[PDB]
């Protein structure tokens, strides 16, 4: 049957990326199989539709797409809440933390995502350090490098870690590092695959023990108008395909990508090094993690926002999801 509505769903990565071929694409079949083509779906990668990375949010609620993929921390101040998923050593691994930010979206931001359809509410799996040149064995080796973050509170831990941080979308990383604005970038190893930047940053730093560096809160947003507008019978065809198992499965995808992209530099199919940080050197990171968990929390509270009820009902949901995880399998 011809489309009742058409859905732009448009977003900063490559076609190529992990995400796009292995659920927006998936994502698209099913929408437009079960509404019997009542919902078609269009995917724009690579900001084709015009606009910067930090735009995309806005885009989707002001309905000038249906649909986009964004970080929410690419818009300094504007998701406070959300902030508490950037914090040192929070998070596991993508499919558990996206799983415990859609569940803390849910029951903490309802006001600062009014307006937007959460399809998911997510985080990216692991970051991790990624260089030029500098083999980063010690916390003395990031001292003065300049390093790319995704957001304002990334970018104070990598301050604090004695690196100069330059915020900017992950977009504008290739041509930074290029030119020697950059020495390197925190992302995930799957946003290297993304980027094309395994044979600029060759140099990758992971860490010790059951949390992971840092990640950042992320998210599939539809237009609630656009949403608002679909008849009874098509919005729970989105409703099928929209929440925190979607968001498992986001996380999930990213955690397979980078196990496939760490694997690659590993076995010498990828020139590269990952460099693992022991326990003790670890320890010294997260000795500096802590001092900004303290600060954010102390910041929050100042501001009128309860900072430790939501660091520890930030913290709980990631032990939960990640337990429930490990006892499966
Ligand atoms: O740090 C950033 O600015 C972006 C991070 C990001 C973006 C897309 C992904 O698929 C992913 O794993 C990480
Ligand atoms: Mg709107």
Redesign the pocket.
């Known amino acids: 049957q011809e489309a009742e509505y058409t859905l732009r769903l448009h977003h900063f990565?490559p076609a190529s990326?992990?995400?796009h071929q292995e659920y927006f694409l998936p994502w698209k079949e099913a929408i437009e199989k079960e509404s019997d083509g009542r919902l078609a779906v269009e995917l724009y990668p690579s900001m084709q539709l015009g606009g910067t990375p930090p735009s995309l949010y806005d885009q989707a609620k002001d309905g000038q797409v249906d649909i986009i993929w964004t970080?929410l921390g690419?818009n300094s101040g504007r998701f406070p809440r959300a902030e508490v998923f950037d914090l040192p050593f929070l998070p596991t691994s993508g499919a558990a933390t996206s799983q415990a930010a859609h569940e803390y979206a849910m029951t903490h931001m309802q006001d600062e995502l009014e307006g937007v359809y959460p399809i998911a509410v997510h985080t990216?799996?692991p970051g991790a350090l990624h260089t030029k040149e500098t083999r980063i064995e010690a916390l003395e080796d990031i001292e003065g490098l300049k390093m790319r973050?995704?957001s304002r509170l990334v970018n104070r831990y990598l301050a604090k870690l004695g690196a100069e941080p330059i915020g900017m979308?992950?977009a504008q990383a290739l041509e930074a590092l290029s030119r020697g604005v950059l020495d390197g970038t925190?992302?995930?190893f799957?946003?290297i695959t993304?980027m094309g930047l395994a044979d600029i940053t060759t140099e990758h730093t992971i860490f010790s023990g059951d949390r992971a560096l840092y990640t950042?809160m992320?998210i599939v947003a539809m237009d609630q108008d656009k949403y608002d507008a679909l008849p009874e019978d098509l919005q729970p065809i989105i409703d099928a395909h929209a929440g925190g198992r979607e968001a498992y499965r986001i996380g999930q995808i990213?955690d397979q990508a980078d196990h496939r992209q760490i694997l690659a530099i590993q076995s010498g199919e990828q020139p590269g090094t990952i460099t693992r940080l022991g326990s003790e050197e670890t320890a010294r990171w997260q000795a500096v993690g802590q001092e900004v968990v303290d600060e954010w929390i102390a910041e929050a509270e100042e501001k009128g926002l309860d900072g430790q009820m939501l660091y520890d009902d930030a913290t709980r949901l990631v032990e939960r999801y990640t337990r429930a995880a490990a006892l499966e399998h």
């Open positions: 990565f990326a992990p995400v970080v690419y990216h799996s973050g995704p979308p992950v925190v992302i995930p799957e946003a993304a950042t992320m990213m």
